[PDB]
């Protein structure tokens, strides 16, 4: 069956917001724990 938010125009903006937050936090943690010294 379809999900609850299927057909909502905010779904792909909020997915890009969550993935952008995840990749920014991942790159920032990588910078602090590998390239900071």
């Amino acid at each position: 069956m379809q999900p609850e938010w299927s057909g909502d125009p905010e779904v792909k903006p909020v997915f890009l917001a969550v993935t952008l937050t995840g990749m920014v936090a991942f790159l920032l943690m990588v910078w602090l724990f590998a390239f900071y010294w």
Partner: protein
């Protein structure tokens, strides 16, 4: 018998379960007040013991050079093994399609969470440098150091963290429509938001119920091998060693069986006062006590089989260290633990075959207390006696526990009972849904004849 007594409706189930929480604090029972006062006094004992341990050292205990693991590790395995039966009722009985989980799983999973909370401090408490528990965790540091990951204590880090996290997650998932029921049944407008933000607007939707049932099924089918792997890893933190009492390969299913044994002992020992002090005779029944004692008898028989396996290994081996392990257990300075273990785990389970003893309530209470004492004695026999006498006879000494590890044990009992009394105050002891669903299923069974 039956797992649900006749004469119950959905609104009666909802009222009779959710009216023990949501009462005003001025109407709190004096029995709860006395039990919480005892629990808070022993929690003060916990705070005093932990403070003196952190001030002075782990040398306030009885541990020494041959016996480096003592009552701290005995109580660790005991408290972490209490939670296995609650995880079994929450997950394995959901997998097996057993209808008696619906009235014991909330309290049993809460007991699992509080027992894991008591047993997760014990690594940090016994650690000797307690503030460096995070060096066992794989974390990024400026040294470039790693945990070894070949030791079983790194597996214990991962297993205890995963067990606590997934148990808390599954308990909260099982609480979310109970949170909705409490949010609906509350009276004050400010305690509506206490359960409203924890229910997240559940609505009881049939589209939401499909995803909920699928998530509960997959969480049960992930938490069954989770709990077996956690208790296997807690077996492995002796079984990967070369110690003659510990290099025994039946330890992972033996520790699984011992944990389920002690867990249902504690579960029965805490259902019976809850059943006789709250109006839950219709929900927690004599059939529930009978089948819980049946699982106690089965798992205690598996632990007796594990004792026979260890005795067979000692007699079958030509190894002098296995032979002296058996001799030391039978006629050593700590043979009281082995003999009391044999009485409390072999003699005391032969009454549980009998139907009248299985149905009897004070016999069940006495048997559960005896099994808890004998399981503490089992963990004493596994750890302390095997560490006392080792390969080199020059490195032999006796482990004598002090007053401080006993005080820490009494204090973790108080922490467990404090968390349990807080749980039975602010949360329902039994699941409001899945018991009205159990009532609907029994109504459908009666309609199907």
């Amino acid at each position: 018998e039956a797992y649900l007594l006749p004469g119950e409706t959905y609104t009666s189930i909802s009222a009779k379960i959710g009216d023990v929480p949501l009462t005003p604090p001025l109407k709190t029972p004096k029995g709860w007040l006395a039990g919480f006062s005892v629990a808070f006094f022993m929690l003060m004992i916990f705070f005093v013991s932990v403070t003196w341990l952190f001030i002075r050292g782990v040398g306030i205990w009885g541990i020494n050079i041959p016996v480096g693991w003592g009552m701290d590790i005995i109580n660790f395995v005991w408290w972490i093994g209490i939670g296995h039966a609650g995880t079994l009722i929450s997950a394995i009985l959901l997998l097996l399609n057993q209808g008696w989980r619906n009235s014991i799983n909330r309290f049993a999973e809460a007991m699992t969470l509080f027992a894991v909370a008591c047993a997760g401090l014990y690594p940090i408490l016994h650690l000797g440098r307690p503030w460096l528990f995070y060096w066992l965790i794989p974390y990024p540091n400026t040294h470039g150091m790693w945990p070894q990951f070949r030791s079983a204590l790194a597996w214990d880090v991962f297993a205890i963290s995963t067990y606590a996290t997934v148990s808390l997650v599954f308990w909260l998932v099982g609480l979310i429509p109970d949170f909705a029921t409490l949010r609906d049944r509350a009276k004050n407008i400010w305690v509506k938001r206490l359960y409203g933000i924890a229910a997240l607007g559940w609505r009881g939707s049939a589209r939401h119920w499909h995803r909920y049932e699928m998530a509960s099924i997959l969480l049960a089918g992930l938490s069954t091998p989770l709990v077996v792997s956690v208790h296997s890893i807690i077996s492995l933190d002796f079984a990967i060693s070369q110690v003659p009492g510990w290099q025994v390969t039946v330890f992972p299913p033996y520790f699984v069986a011992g944990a389920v044994f002690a867990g249902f002992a504690m579960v029965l020992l805490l259902m019976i006062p809850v059943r006789t002090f709250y109006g839950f005779e219709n929900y927690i029944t004599l059939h529930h006590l009978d089948v819980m004692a049946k699982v106690m008898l089965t798992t205690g028989m598996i632990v007796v089989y594990g004792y026979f396996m260890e005795v067979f290994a000692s007699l079958y081996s030509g190894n002098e260290f296995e032979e002296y392990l058996l001799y030391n257990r039978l006629f050593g300075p700590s043979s009281w633990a082995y003999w009391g273990l044999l009485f409390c785990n072999a003699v005391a389970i032969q009454p549980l075959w009998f139907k009248k003893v299985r149905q009897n309530i004070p016999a069940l209470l006495i048997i559960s207390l005896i099994v808890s004492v004998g399981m503490w004695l089992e963990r004493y026999v596994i750890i302390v006696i095997s560490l006392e006498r080792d390969f080199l006879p020059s490195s032999w000494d006796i482990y004598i526990p002090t007053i401080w590890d006993w005080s820490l044990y009494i204090g973790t009992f108080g922490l467990f009972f404090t968390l349990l009394f807080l749980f039975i105050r602010v949360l329902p002891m039994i699941n409001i849904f899945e018991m009205r669903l159990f009532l609907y299923q029994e109504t459908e069974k009666a309609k199907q004849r």
